[PDB]
Amino acid sequence: FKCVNSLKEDHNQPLFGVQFNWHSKEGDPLVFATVGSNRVTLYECHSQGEIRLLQSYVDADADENFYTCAWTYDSNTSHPLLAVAGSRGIIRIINPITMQCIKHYVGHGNAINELKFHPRDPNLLLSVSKDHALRLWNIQTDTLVAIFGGVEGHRDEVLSADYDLLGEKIMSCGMDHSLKLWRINSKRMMNAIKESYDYNPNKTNRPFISQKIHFPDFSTRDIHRNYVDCVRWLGDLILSKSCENAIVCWKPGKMEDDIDKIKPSESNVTILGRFDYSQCDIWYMRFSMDFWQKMLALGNQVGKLYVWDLECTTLTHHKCGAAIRQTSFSRDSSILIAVCDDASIWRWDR
Numbered sequence: 001f002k003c004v005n006s007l008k009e010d011h012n013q014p015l016f017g018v019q020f021n022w023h024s025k026e027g028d029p030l031v032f033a034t035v036g037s038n039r040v041t042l043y044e045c046h047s048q049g050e051i052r053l054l055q056s057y058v059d060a061d062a063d064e065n066f067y068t069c070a071w072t073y074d075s076n077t078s079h080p081l082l083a084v085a086g087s088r089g090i091i092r093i094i095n096p097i098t099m100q101c102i103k104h105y106v107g108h109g110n111a112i113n114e115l116k117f118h119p120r121d122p123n124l125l126l127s128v129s130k131d132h133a134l135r136l137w138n139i140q141t142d143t144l145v146a147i148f149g150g151v152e153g154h155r156d157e158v159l160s161a162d163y164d165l166l167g168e169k170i171m172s173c174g175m176d177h178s179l180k181l182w183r184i185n186s187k188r189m190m191n192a193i194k195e196s197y198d199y200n201p202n203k204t205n206r207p208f209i210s211q212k213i214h215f216p217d218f219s220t221r222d223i224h225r226n227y228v229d230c231v232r233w234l235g236d237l238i239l240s241k242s243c244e245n246a247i248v249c250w251k252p253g254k255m256e257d258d259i260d261k262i263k264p265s266e267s268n269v270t271i272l273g274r275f276d277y278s279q280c281d282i283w284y285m286r287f288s289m290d291f292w293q294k295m296l297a298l299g300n301q302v303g304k305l306y307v308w309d310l311e312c313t314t315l316t317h318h319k320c321g322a323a324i325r326q327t328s329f330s331r332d333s334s335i336l337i338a339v340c341d342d343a344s345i346w347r348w349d350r
């Protein structure tokens with residue numbers, strides 16, 4: 001990788017999220033979204049390190065602080081869609097062509113920390129909140145499918161979540177130091193997803209009833225000793241981090257335990273390895289994998305970017321000294337974008 005370009009957004013506020021649109025065809029524009037303050041900004045990556053500003057979305061609320069974004073597509077037209085959320089705890093669906101808000105979702109009792117779209121179903125949106133819960137929405141029928149939380153749910157703010165390869169299960173993590181598994185391929189969840197597609201408030205005066213999922217399918221507090229702020233699946237394995245200068249690779253149960261044979265009472269975990277680094281001991285620092293899950297990247301609090309080959313290189317620039325909150329690889333992994341606390345954007349080309 002080589003740093004080919006850098007820019008700074010006019011608002012001067014930290015950038016907390018960045019996502020390349022992985023739903024674009026080869027030979028079509030390489031587009032990424034950034035989120036900071038009450039702004040959502042789209043950019044195009046061109047040859048010779050060129051970054052072109054496409055459009056900006058400024059939220060009506062000046063007090064809104066976007067923390068996360070996620071791309072999807074309209075299942076009927078294949079047109080891209082962008083979901084954004086933050087401090088207001090409102091999910092906003094943006095048309096990226098016009099950069100206008102199509103619709104919004106209200107429900108969480110507090111800020112939304114992360115948004116994730118189901119890897120098979122482009123209409124299933126997962127939100128994680130400061131209210132200790134996770135919510136699964138069907139954005140085609142504007143329905144709340146399920147709420148993951150309560151008695152055995154997270155006991156503090158949820159910071160991150162990730163669907164596995166097929167979207168059969170979710171792993172969530174947060175301020176209570178725990179990592180919790182939620183199976184969504186259960187007869188109950190599959191039926192709830194099916195029913196959410198049959199719902200239309202214009203053909204019934206009755207509200208759609210959300211599944212109240214009080215119990216996870218696995219839980220551990222034995223990986224990290226502080227806020228778990230990022231979780232990703234690596235096949236049947238888990239990559240997770242706290243502010244303890246390490247990304248831990250682990251799995252539920254004993255070494256040979258199949259993840260789909262794990263019972264909710266499972267008291268064991270197996271640590272398979274760690275990715276060690278420095279000066280990334282502050283809260284709210286995201287690691288990211290490329291589409292192929294062959295590359296791993298994490299920015300640190302003083303502008304250094306760590307990249308590991310999953311099959312360590314430290315990317316540095318003398319002008320990049322602010323905390324790197326999130327990174328995003330282009331679909332082909334040829335480009336790596338880093339976003340910072342000083343509203344700066346950094347482009348690294350392979």
Ligand SMILES: CS(=O)(=O)c1ccc(-c2cnc(NCc3cccc4c3CCO4)n3cnnc23)cc1
Pocket residue numbers: 014016017067068111112113114159160229230283284285286325326341
């Ligand atoms: C400059 S400052 O004033 O010190 C500051 C620093 C961080 C935050 C902040 C950031 N992000 C989130 N949530 C999303 C989140 C969750 C897990 C990992 C992660 C992210 C974004 C990057 O990595 N926050 C929720 N409440 N506050 C925050 C706000 C102000």
Ligand SMILES: [Ca+2]
Pocket residue numbers: 236258259260
């Ligand atoms: Ca399995």
Ligand SMILES: [Ca+2]
Pocket residue numbers: 260
């Ligand atoms: Ca299986």
